[PDB]
Design a protein around this nucleic acid. Structure first.
Ligand code: FES
Ligand SMILES: [K+]
Ligand SMILES: [K+]
Ligand SMILES: [K+]
Ligand SMILES: [K+]
Ligand SMILES: [Mg+2]
Ligand SMILES: [Mg+2]
Ligand SMILES: [Mg+2]
Ligand SMILES: [Mg+2]
Ligand SMILES: [Mg+2]
Ligand SMILES: [Mg+2]
Ligand SMILES: [Mg+2]
Ligand SMILES: [Mg+2]
Ligand SMILES: [Mg+2]
Ligand SMILES: [Mg+2]
Ligand SMILES: [Mg+2]
Ligand SMILES: [Mg+2]
Ligand SMILES: [Mg+2]
Ligand SMILES: [Mg+2]
Ligand SMILES: [Mg+2]
Ligand SMILES: [Mg+2]
Ligand SMILES: [Mg+2]
Ligand SMILES: [Mg+2]
Ligand SMILES: [Mg+2]
Ligand SMILES: [Mg+2]
Lengths: 108, 136, 170, 70
RNA sequence: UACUUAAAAUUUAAGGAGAGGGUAUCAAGCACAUUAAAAUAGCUUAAGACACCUUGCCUAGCCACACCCCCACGGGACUCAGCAGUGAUAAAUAUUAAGCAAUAAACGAAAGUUUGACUAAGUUAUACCUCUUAGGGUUGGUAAAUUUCGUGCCAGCCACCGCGGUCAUACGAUUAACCCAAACUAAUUAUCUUCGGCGUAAAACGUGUCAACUAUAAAUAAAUAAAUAGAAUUAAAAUCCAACUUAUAUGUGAAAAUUCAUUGUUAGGACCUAAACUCAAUAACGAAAGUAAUUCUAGUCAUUUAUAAUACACGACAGCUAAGACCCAAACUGGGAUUAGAUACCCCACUAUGCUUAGCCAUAAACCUAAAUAAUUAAAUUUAACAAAACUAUUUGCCAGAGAACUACUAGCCAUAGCUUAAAACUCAAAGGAC
């Protein structure tokens, strides 16, 4: 662009930073609604443990439960955080082990 | 160990540099000679480029003043029936004698080109040279 | 590569090299120059090189330039008194034009120095406060004075916590 | 290569979709123009009422500019 | 506070050199102006008016607010956005504390009095500092650092690339090592921001003319073979009519259907529909689209140069509307064949349409996939590669990963299954270009 065109336009227009599943918040608290399995996209082959939750914001989201084995059930309370599950499409939240009803993976 | 880079510098500059670095311990025998009696131009690589737009070379077309007279002689009489001998360094052709006489008359002060052309023909006719005014 | 011709003109150092600071009387400077010709070359160079420097040091002066309106280039200054100073810059180099206007309508070095000193009258080195305005925020920074408790713990006897305990003991 | 094929294949699926729902789109349009006309009339009524007139200027009838006048 | 009149601090009102968030799919606002006999028809606006959305900024501090109705006569849902504290809510969690001793403020002539301002404490790894215990994470690559065993595309892991189906340095335990350390790791947010590009990758967006700026500096042009419009004209080949006339004619790879109202010949007649061989191995004209049968009439031309839309005028083909034309061609349609099927390719017939007269539509790989203009050919320039050698300057337009998307919505349009304008959600770690 010419100096006259750069002057008439100024600095580049910047698209606003749209928020993610947590809505720009470190963590959210949600109540479990269902516990189900999600299948990772090929080539990955597994039965990943996830759950649907109703967040404090009022929306409903699908959250991956990390770790080897969870005791979560319907009506339980959990603290969800950000971080997408790469193989699981649409799963943009994860549960924090050791907070509220969810507990640390049971080393056995 | 050497500098086989013939596109950077010259044989002399690369030899000077290699000795400064410490890789070449003995001077080549041709080195001192080049230092004392170098060439006029430094032999450095240059990529020949083409000329573009209105760039032109600077070569003078070699045209002497005799050529104006010689052109008329070839158009009027052609080349002399006697054959050119280009091995004799002092050869005088029929056309060169025409130009020598044409010059002599012009030194006298004749200003008309037509006068100098027909008078020279008459003088050579007296000399006995066979000039044929071949229009063909 | 910076765009345009002579990109050095678009640097703060170049703009600050200008030495023509007009007197308070100067209010407008009209520049009449021709884009084609031979006797107006200095005028064209003055618009190209010097007008930015003049505006930088005289932000409140209106510089308005008109092109190819007259046979010859000239400068006309409009003063606050109502006087109009015409300058003829034909056959004059851009450097010559700057020196001429500096002489007739430019502040002298003495006047400018006095203004600079007066501007800084209220800054005192001894004054304490934020870094933006002062050298030192607190007297603890000074050598020999009691250091800040945050950096160096105070003696117990100089602390209100300790003094209160003794008063209770009394 | 695949970018014109995709424009072609995308454009092919739009023309098919428009054909399947051509009659629905016609009724959508006639209603969007009617709302477009009412919005035009109301915007003109706002002007004279704000100016203080209690009736539209004498001999004025809002032109119907979105109807099948041509 | 001084004088009985002058220095300040502090405000208020009216203003304006300049600077000042986002959306132009917010493009018009609709009285927003001047004059001062009260007339004139003006005022702001692509140099961004108007509308809407969002946000405290100008930081020794400033501005706005003080339960709500912008305000607070009035009304209402009737007061901690003072300190401490409580309920609810939230990922978010300080004492219902002491003293007016210091400084500040209020009051008093004053000794003095008052103050949840403030001061000294309490609470909390949130930070810094000084010390003393050591814990936290990681160990496939980026990126410092793994031994044994279990698991076997399962269980699990990853910021990106990826790992796991029997020798897993990548998962789990264990061993050691690495990093940091009263912290450590995770999540969230923040700090980095246009002088780069536009033949082939995002992007010169069909064509030209008129403005204002920004640049530039010269006083010419035209006289051109197929620009364009009108009128007149016609050579070859068809069509029609007529004479004579084979028995067939037509059609394919091969056949069938079609046909004998055909066929062939005509130095017979009519027609003037449609298209313009050779020239053309040419490279002209026009802004582009486009334009080459002949003749005649009208006709292209000077603005220094570049630079234009919200205006004006054009814009292949196909398509729409109305009245005509119709040799030939030909979507569609029917017939014949072909094939497992033919909804095609091949054959026959025939229509819209191609033509004219009036409008409309405004679309192309509208492409030389090259914006225009003036330079230079050397700057030790294959500055990727391939195209079309490279490159400087000027002005405008345009571009900012891919898909979603020649889409949705918006506005304009003779357009109504239309064109121009043109997003987001969401998804992926690529997409793409040249070799
Ligand atoms: S900053 Fe000076 S005493 Fe703390
Ligand atoms: K896999
Ligand atoms: K209020
Ligand atoms: K006190
Ligand atoms: K381990
Ligand atoms: Mg929209
Ligand atoms: Mg309240
Ligand atoms: Mg109020
Ligand atoms: Mg409180
Ligand atoms: Mg109160
Ligand atoms: Mg906190
Ligand atoms: Mg007092
Ligand atoms: Mg193993
Ligand atoms: Mg790892
Ligand atoms: Mg491991
Ligand atoms: Mg492109
Ligand atoms: Mg187009
Ligand atoms: Mg005709
Ligand atoms: Mg004529
Ligand atoms: Mg027809
Ligand atoms: Mg092309
Ligand atoms: Mg299209
Ligand atoms: Mg569309
Ligand atoms: Mg639309
Ligand atoms: Mg997007």
């Amino acid at each position: 662009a010419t100096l006259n065109q750069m002057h008439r336009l100024g600095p580049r227009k910047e698209p606003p930073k749209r928020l993610g599943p947590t809505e720009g918040r470190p963590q959210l608290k949600g109540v479990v609604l269902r516990t189900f399995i999600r299948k990772p996209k090929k080539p990955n082959s597994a039965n990943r443990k996830c759950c649907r939750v109703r967040l404090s914001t009022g929306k409903e989201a699908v959250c991956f439960i990390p770790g080897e084995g969870h005791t979560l059930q319907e009506h339980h309370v959990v603290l969800v955080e950000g971080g997408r599950t790469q193989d699981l499409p649409g799963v943009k939240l994860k549960v924090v082990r050791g907070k509220y009803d969810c507990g640390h993976v049971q080393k056995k | 160990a050497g500098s086989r880079l013939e596109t950077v510098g010259s044989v002399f500059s690369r030899t000077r540099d290699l000795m400064r670095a410490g890789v070449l311990k003995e001077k080549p025998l041709w080195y001192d000679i080049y230092k004392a009696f170098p060439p006029l131009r430094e032999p450095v690589f240059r990529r020949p480029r083409l000329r573009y737009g209105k760039a032109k070379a600077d070569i003078q077309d070699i045209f002497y003043q005799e050529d104006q007279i010689r052109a008329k002689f070839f158009a009027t009489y052609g080349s002399g029936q006697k054959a050119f001998d280009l091995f004799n360094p002092n050869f005088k052709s029929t056309c060169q004698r025409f130009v020598e006489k044409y010059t002599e008359l012009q030194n006298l002060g004749e200003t008309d080109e037509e006068k100098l052309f027909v008078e020279t023909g008459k003088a050579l006719l007296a000399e006995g040279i066979i000039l044929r005014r071949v229009r063909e | 590569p910076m765009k345009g011709r002579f990109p050095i003109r678009r640097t703060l150092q170049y703009l600050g090299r200008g030495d023509v600071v007009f007197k308070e009387s100067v209010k407008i400077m009209t520049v009449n120059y021709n884009t084609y010709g031979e006797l107006g070359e200095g005028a064209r160079k003055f618009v190209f090189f010097n007008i930015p420097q003049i505006q930088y040091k005289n932000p409140w002066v209106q510089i308005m330039m008109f092109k190819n309106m007259t046979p010859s280039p000239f400068l006309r200054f409009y003063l606050d008194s109502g006087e109009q100073v015409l300058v003829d810059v034909e056959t004059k180099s851009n450097k010559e034009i700057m020196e001429h206007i500096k002489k007739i309508l430019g502040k002298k070095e003495e006047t400018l120095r006095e203004e600079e000193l007066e501007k800084q009258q209220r800054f005192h080195p001894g004054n304490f406060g934020p870094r933006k305005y002062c050298l030192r925020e607190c007297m603890c920074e000074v050598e020999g004075q009691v250091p800040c408790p945050g950096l160096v713990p105070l003696p117990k006897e100089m602390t209100g916590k300790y003094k209160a305990a003794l008063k209770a003991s009394t | 290569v695949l970018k014109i094929r995709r424009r072609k294949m995308n454009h092919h699926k739009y023309r098919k979709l428009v054909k399947r729902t051509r009659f629905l789109r016609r009724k959508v349009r006639e209603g969007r123009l009617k709302k477009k006309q009412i919005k035009f009339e109301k915007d003109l009524k706002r002007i004279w009422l704000k100016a203080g007139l209690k009736e539209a200027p004498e001999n004025w009838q809002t032109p119907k500019i979105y109807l099948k006048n041509k």
